[PDB]
């Protein structure tokens, strides 16, 4: 249940980002899951796929303030209440 | 224990700059050749005085002459523990004169 909240990049990379966060959920889908392992997976996948200097962040209540390259930023929400931010720098 | 060390080519520096700017393409006049050498040897020595080597002793040597259908060979040998002591040597030859300088360096201990 992906709910995109703020988009900056191109729709293809949008789709692949959603697919990768999904695959991360399945890699870690259990009460013992940690968002950190899925974060590692998201960042490393987007590195080996669309280049380095990616950054994955997952949570539900927090406050970031980060610098991002244009057309390389996404933030979104899940019906499962997972707010997911990703960005390249 | 050698914190500040001697490597060849800063004396090689000094000796080059000295040679061009002082020789300025001078001819080999017999009456003043030995005294020309006497002047520039002491100037070179002054330069190695600021050459920033505290314990390295400096065996300056210089050759100056004119080339006239004349074959020549000059060589030296080095005689020290390679870890500390070292040497430097430069040549400078125009159409009719040649001046070459060598400078030893031996870390005192």
């Amino acid at each position: 249940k992906a709910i995109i909240n703020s988009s900056d990049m191109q729709g293809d990379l949008l789709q692949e980002a959603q697919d990768v966060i999904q695959s991360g959920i399945e890699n870690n889908s259990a009460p013992v899951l940690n968002i950190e392992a899925a974060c590692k997976y998201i960042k490393e996948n987007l590195d080996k796929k669309f280049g380095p200097t990616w950054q994955c962040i997952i949570g539900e209540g927090y406050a970031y303030d980060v610098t991002v390259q244009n057309n390389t930023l996404l933030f979104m929400f899940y019906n499962g209440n997972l707010a997911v931010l990703i960005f390249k720098s | 224990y050698i914190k500040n060390r001697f490597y060849p080519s800063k004396i090689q520096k000094i000796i080059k700059e000295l040679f061009e700017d002082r020789l300025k393409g001078v001819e080999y006049d017999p009456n003043n050749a030995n005294q020309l050498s006497e002047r520039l040897v002491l100037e070179l020595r002054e330069k190695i005085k600021r050459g920033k080597v505290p314990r390295y002793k400096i065996g300056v040597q210089v050759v100056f002459g004119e080339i006239k259908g004349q074959g020549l060979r000059i060589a030296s040998k080095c005689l020290w523990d390679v870890q500390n002591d070292n040497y430097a040597s430069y040549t400078y030859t125009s159409e009719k004169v040649y001046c070459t300088g060598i400078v030893f360096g031996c870390y005192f201990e």
């Binding site: - | 060979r73 060589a75 040998k77 005689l79 002591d85 031996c106």
Partner: protein
């Protein structure tokens, strides 16, 4: 208490006195000879050592000589040793007349 410049002067005296002639015709009537090159090398060395022991210096010497036939082949002569800074050293010399490429290499050491 010496000078390698004078060591070279003595070597030059020896060689140019033995075979070197000012008037340059006998030096090619004397070309490289398979029969006489042995006499040449031995006598060059002997006269050079006689010049060296004319010197009363207490230093110790050793000598080497090379005689090349022709410039077509090419040669590289290089020297290296391990001795004391103040007094020891060496010397080299290349020599050419018409068809004889002579080379002398001397080591001088203390004691």
């Amino acid at each position: 208490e010496y000078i390698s410049e004078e060591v070279q002067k003595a070597i030059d005296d020896s060689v140019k006195q033995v075979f070197g002639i000012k008037d340059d015709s006998s030096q090619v009537t004397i070309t490289y000879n398979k029969d006489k090159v042995n006499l040449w090398t031995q006598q060059i060395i002997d006269y050079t050592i006689r010049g060296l022991n004319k010197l009363g210096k207490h230093f110790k010497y050793c000598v080497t000589a090379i005689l090349q036939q022709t410039n077509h082949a090419g040669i590289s002569v290089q020297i290296t040793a391990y001795q004391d800074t103040n007094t020891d050293g060496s010397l080299i010399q290349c020599y050419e007349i018409n068809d004889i490429y002579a080379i002398v290499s001397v080591f001088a050491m203390a004691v």
